[PDB]
Design a binder for this molecule. Sequence first.
Ligand SMILES: Nc1ncnc2c1ncn2[C@@H]1O[C@H](COP(=O)(O)OP(=O)(O)OP(=O)(O)O)[C@@H](O)[C@H]1O
Lengths: 138, 560
Amino acid sequence: EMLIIDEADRLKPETFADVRDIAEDLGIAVVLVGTDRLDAVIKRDEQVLERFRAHLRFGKLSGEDFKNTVEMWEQMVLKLPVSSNLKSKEMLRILTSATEGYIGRLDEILREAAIRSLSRGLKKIDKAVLQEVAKEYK
Amino acid sequence: ASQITIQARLISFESNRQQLWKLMADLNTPLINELLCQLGQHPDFEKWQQKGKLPSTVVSQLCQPLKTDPRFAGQPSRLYMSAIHIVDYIYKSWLAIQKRLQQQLDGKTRWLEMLNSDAELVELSGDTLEAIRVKAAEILAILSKTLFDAYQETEDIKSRSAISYLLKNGCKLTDKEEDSEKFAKRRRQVEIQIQRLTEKLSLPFPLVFETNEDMVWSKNQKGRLCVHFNGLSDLIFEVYCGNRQLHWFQRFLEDQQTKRKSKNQHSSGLFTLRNGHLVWLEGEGKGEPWNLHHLTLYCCVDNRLWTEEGTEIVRQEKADEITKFITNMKKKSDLSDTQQALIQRKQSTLTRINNSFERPSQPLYQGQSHILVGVSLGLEKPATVAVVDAIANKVLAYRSIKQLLGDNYELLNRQRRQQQYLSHERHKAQKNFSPNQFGASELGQHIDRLLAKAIVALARTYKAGSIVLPKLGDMREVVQSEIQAIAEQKFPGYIEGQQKYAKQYRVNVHRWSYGRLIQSIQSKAAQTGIVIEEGKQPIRGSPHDKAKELALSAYNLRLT
RNA sequence: UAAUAGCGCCGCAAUUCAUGCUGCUUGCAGCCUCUGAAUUUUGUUAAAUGAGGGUUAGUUUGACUGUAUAAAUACAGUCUUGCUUUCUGACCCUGGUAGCUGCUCACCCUGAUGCUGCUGUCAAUAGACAGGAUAGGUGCGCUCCCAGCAAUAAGGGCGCGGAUACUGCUGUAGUGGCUACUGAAUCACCCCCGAUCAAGGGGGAACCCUAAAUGGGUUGAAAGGAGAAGUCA
Ligand SMILES: Nc1ncnc2c1ncn2[C@@H]1O[C@H](COP(=O)(O)OP(=O)(O)OP(=O)(O)O)[C@@H](O)[C@H]1O
């Protein structure tokens, strides 16, 4: 029913004809995923641009919802004995300062800090290791 | 350094102007012409071209046996010294271009004879470039002015080739240990340029009066201001200025009288007048030259000396540069006769500098440069600004070109239309054509000044400490990239349409004049007191975003 | 008759926003009402653009001192000169007579960043005569497009002569440039006499103050750095 082509800025212009053909004859919803470069990639396409025009931009996530996500990563993914950290405005300033809202960076930073702190024996995450990963990104 | 020039026409009798035209057009300019030719055929000429310093006294030495010449005699001492000075500085710029051309030709002949390709480098020198390149890199990158001078000095085939390779390869951590193309293209471009250089190996001059007092001021019996110059006191000219420039001239007479009334206890040298040219403008019509062309004074006035508070700044600059001059001359033991006269004049100025004339009272504004007005230059928008905080990351206020040129926008539109028309006419002019100034004006300069005034005023409103401007060198790449960005913005991937639209855009939206704008902003900001820094304009983004990021990059580099 | 389309501008929307607006909640919430920004998106019975050539030491943007005012700015006082510019008006014009010169044309064909293109009037000739900046096309322009011409782009063809680098077929013929003298405006509320390397002097009007006194006032505004040389294109 649906053909999700992830990283759909890679495939050559001469295969958009075949994905057009698939969507054209089989009645299959083709969903092209990709960085913004994909849009320019189809911009050159004359029908690909017409056929694939409904879109859904990924949110940047910044704001109170970002604050929720931060705490949501503590419980769901970090899985540590509760340390009463609670991602206070300090850690939030650090993470807004460091990640710029990208979920990847939120994940990359938190996993690194957790691994570092557990490798050095620290049971929870200190402000020290948070400053460490912050500087070593930017 | 806030030197500015005011001007005023000089009106006098026809006989008073026949003397000045004949004295200059028939005897003073020919002295400059001969002084220029002689300074060229001087044996040490090629020694000068290697340096940037023509000797202090050489132009004077060639003029002393020239003052008594049958065709260069009767010139007032100021006329003679002006001509000498003209030869030093008019021929200064002349021989500066001369040694650019002459010494460039010499170096091209030399680089052509010595510099070589990678193949000939291996054949003759045959040194491994990676090793010596990395060695020089750890020598220089690990005061680098000495190292760069050493690169400027090393000329042996292996040494110059390797050091230039290191310089053009990045002189840093580059993972591509390659590109003998550096000295390959060096020698190739040298051969082309040496081929080129082997194939190609009605208004009198002004009167610069380097002394302020050579112009003696007086008030006419009708109250008008009058001038007569040193060496020509029988020639009296009446200052026909404009009321905007009048307070300078009334200051000149007042300053000169103030020194007179103190029995020369006051230092001419804190005068609001520093020097003055005496040029002839060009008139329209016919007639003897003195009756057509308008004699004009161009007084260079240090605007900083107008206020009494500003004078103390000048009083401190001169009292610091001159007390250093004394110490510099006090170490020598030569003790020449006229040298001690020069020493004597110095301490005379220091004593005379602490006698203050009456000037207006102004609390010179103190500027904190942390605020960074960022100015972005482009094609689609000729100029946009962004007043942004650096400690924070918020933009206080943007302004676009339609908003800085208040009521001056129709001027920008009609100037773009005029620059289109004049460019089409110049292209239609081909090679054979009448003078191309037909229909030209200085509307571009008026707009480049209206824009600078508005930008500086905006900076002053928000207490901005510095105005940031793009480096002028990166103003061809920036405009080319902006044209490309607009092209892909209009036509996404249709390359034919992109090229066609780029052509049609270059037809209509011509390149701005990003030299006069950067210069006018530099003048206006320096006059007001706002220092100017330079950053790197981002390649893409919206003009407001480009301005903001330029301003932030400037502060980031200032942090260094 | 035609100007399609393109490209640049200018509005007019529409949306999104803040550099706004609003609110304190004081850095968030709305809002698009002004002001902007950023899109896109039309060309409305219209909004704003708007490119034929000229004319003023034009007016305004000013200095000092004092006051209010932190300053700006205001106000009062005193002084005032005309420079070099950018506009906005207003007005004038669509030039003549003399010379000296430049180019281009045998004849075709394509058609250039090529030239021309207004309104009447009389011809309807190719030109006058009156007007006249609204001036082919689009809201407004263009090197775009349309219409004519195209020898004066470039290219191709191609006749006769002479030469055997190239010429001639060429009439002021068509278009340029230069000089000399002339035509009009010569201004900034208007009119007149004047200066213009200097010069202002008069006479009106409207309005405002003032009942009314050429009593006084007012009858568009802005910006400054100039010279010289060289290089590139
Ligand atoms: N639902 C999720 N749970 C946990 N981590 C997530 C989630 N979504 C995203 N991330 C994390 O956020 C980061 C985003 O990486 P990801 O590969 O998804 O990026 P992307 O934007 O899809 O990349 P690309 O543009 O190359 O396709 C990763 O570190 C990923 O693990």
